[PDB]
């Protein structure tokens, strides 16, 4: 068995552009960072408050072959992405969320 961690991805608009605010299971603002100490999953739930019809399309990595995250799964409605982390390779990876929107055909990225 592993652990399952749950982060809410709140997206609001400020000065006409998206702002990503992560909340934890306590309702506290956080950075959306996770320390993994055994095999398990991380679940990100989208709360789109932008009116721009945001949907997750995946999770993007500049170093996708580093072995920190094993896999990404996505719900059919784009409201959830989950990461499988078997925590065999030690180290750190960074990623950005990738989203579609209904205002235009550009994909949306979290800044970090």
């Amino acid at each position: 068995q592993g652990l399952a961690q749950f982060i809410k991805v709140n997206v609001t608009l400020e000065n006409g552009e998206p702002v990503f605010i992560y909340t934890d299971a306590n309702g506290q603002v956080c950075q959306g960072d996770i320390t993994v100490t055994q095999a398990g999953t991380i679940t990100y739930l989208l709360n789109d408050q932008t009116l721009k019809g945001l949907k997750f399309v995946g999770v993007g990595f500049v170093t996708p072959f580093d072995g920190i995250i094993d896999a990404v799964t996505i719900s059919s409605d784009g409201m959830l992405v989950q990461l499988v982390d078997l925590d065999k390779t030690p180290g750190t990876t960074a990623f950005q969320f990738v989203l579609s929107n209904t205002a235009n055909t550009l994909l949306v990225l979290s800044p970090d």
Partner: peptide, 7 residues
């Protein structure tokens, strides 16, 4: 965000 793995 960042994931840190401690195995």
């Amino acid at each position: 965000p960042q994931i840190i793995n401690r195995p």
